[PDB]
Amino acid sequence: DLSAASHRIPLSDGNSIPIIGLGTYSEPKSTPKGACATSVKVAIDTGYRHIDGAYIYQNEHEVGEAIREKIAEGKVRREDIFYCGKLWATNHVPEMVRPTLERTLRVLQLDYVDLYIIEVPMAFKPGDEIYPRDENGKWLYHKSNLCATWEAMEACKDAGLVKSLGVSNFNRRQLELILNKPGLKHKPVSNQVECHPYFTQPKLLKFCQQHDIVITAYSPLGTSRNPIWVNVSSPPLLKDALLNSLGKRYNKTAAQIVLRFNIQRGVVVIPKSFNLERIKENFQIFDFSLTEEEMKDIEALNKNVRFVELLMWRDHPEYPFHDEY
Ligand SMILES: NC(=O)c1ccc[n+]([C@@H]2O[C@H](COP(=O)([O-])OP(=O)(O)OC[C@H]3O[C@@H](n4cnc5c(N)ncnc54)[C@H](OP(=O)(O)O)[C@@H]3O)[C@@H](O)[C@H]2O)c1
């Protein structure tokens, strides 16, 4: 059903999303300027039609430059590209939502985004500082009001500034608060969370399927394993013995196996790479498939251990990972 030329799956609001996209987060202080822009252009030339980014990644402008250059080149039309942007924790106050989205539209120099989502369910103190803390280093929070924030997001879609609305890092309870709100106009069509063979998200995936919510798997290759912040106590996903053995069966790498695993499952994947060769490699997942047995072999690798724990915010009232799911 999925092919390199046609691989967009349906969203509940009538729109669709390419099952594979290019992730764009990269350590600001150590990433050479221009690397993102170059990588997005390579991705589009390769066949990618979905790009995932965020204003807080510090390189959202590079994503826009690349997209606009390829449209000017005649390679693709605006309607052929799918961009996802995100609303950070410091911008949850209802009145700040549209203004924040409009800032991202100026940065990209585009009229609308295809998908805009609430980055985390936790509200932080408003301000320029993306990671606000007081003199004693204590995190500065704000009282969350997910429904009020959602109503502001719905207004953005009515204004034509975004085609689809979704969320990220939301657990079952949080999704239900929005799903059951009186006067709901646009239900969430997507929930972006960490997902790969070591954290398969069995119960959250099933809840989302029952409500027609598509899951987008972030850190689909297990993260960059940056010792500065990743939970590296859990082993390197791409070096897994089984995943590598399965790759030898089809002459594919472990990375290609884990990506095929999720897409064949109806789960969107957004692997990040700023390397020419690897950007190409990740897209070659439509010329083979995994047997029903192999899908079960992979599902069994689940350790229920997150690479992205966000332990520094476990004290926030809306921290999403205390619950089972
Ligand atoms: N919603 C959220 O809160 C949230 C959180 C985390 C991430 N995300 C999104 O999800 C995207 C993907 O997640 P991620 O960046 O954390 O990690 P990831 O995609 O799981 O892994 C990226 C790392 O793998 C390397 N890599 C890429 N392709 C490879 C291949 N074929 N073989 C070997 N290594 C390969 C990359 O290096 P090279 O670049 O050198 O290839 C990089 O170090 C992000 O960029 C971002 O857009 C969202």
Ligand SMILES: CC(=O)[C@H]1CC[C@H]2[C@@H]3CC[C@@H]4CC(=O)CC[C@]4(C)[C@H]3CC[C@]12C
């Ligand atoms: C409090 C911290 O140590 C910061 C520095 C690194 C930040 C992480 C970078 C990767 C992604 C980026 C996002 O989109 C939000 C979630 C993380 C995990 C981000 C969390 C804040 C960190 C750990």
